[PDB]
Nucleic acid binder design. Sequence first.
RNA 1: UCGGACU
Length: 191
Amino acid sequence: GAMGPSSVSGAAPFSSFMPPEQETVHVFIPAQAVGAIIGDDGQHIKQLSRFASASIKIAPPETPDSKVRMVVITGPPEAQFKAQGRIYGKLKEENFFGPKEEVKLETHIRVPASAAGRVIGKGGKTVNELQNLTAAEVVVPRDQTPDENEQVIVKIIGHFYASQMAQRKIRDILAQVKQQHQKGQSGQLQA
RNA sequence: UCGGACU
């Protein structure tokens, strides 16, 4: 509903719209915590957009899991690190579940189905390593349960410092797997 | 040494 005639035609058609084809993570916070993030004039979450340099979209009560709300963080690692830690710490400052409890969010990151059992380490090894030492609990889907685009989602349950280290290591191994797949023997023992 | 677990 923007009926702008646009009669002005400059040699430089400055397009004010931006396509968020950036790295998109989905992390959810309890519905009570959503009130703290969104509640501030209903724009503080949208402030995160420019602040974290990302396209911030908030989930309405659409999905049956509406006991929580999934936030759509579309942006580079800049936004991933900034927004994720920002909201994570925000749950702490808001004295919801911070002084008497540790904030435990679930970050969904994009992993290829062909590497689902790879990011979990050599048989749930990354879970043991990251949970015990880093306090980052990493969980994968049962076997894979893949999307047609061979997409699976792996969850990070922990704390800001842990989650960042975990998601970095996961994508670290992950990326190098796909590279090894391409620049190698694909996935067969022929020679 | 690239498998599958832990919820």
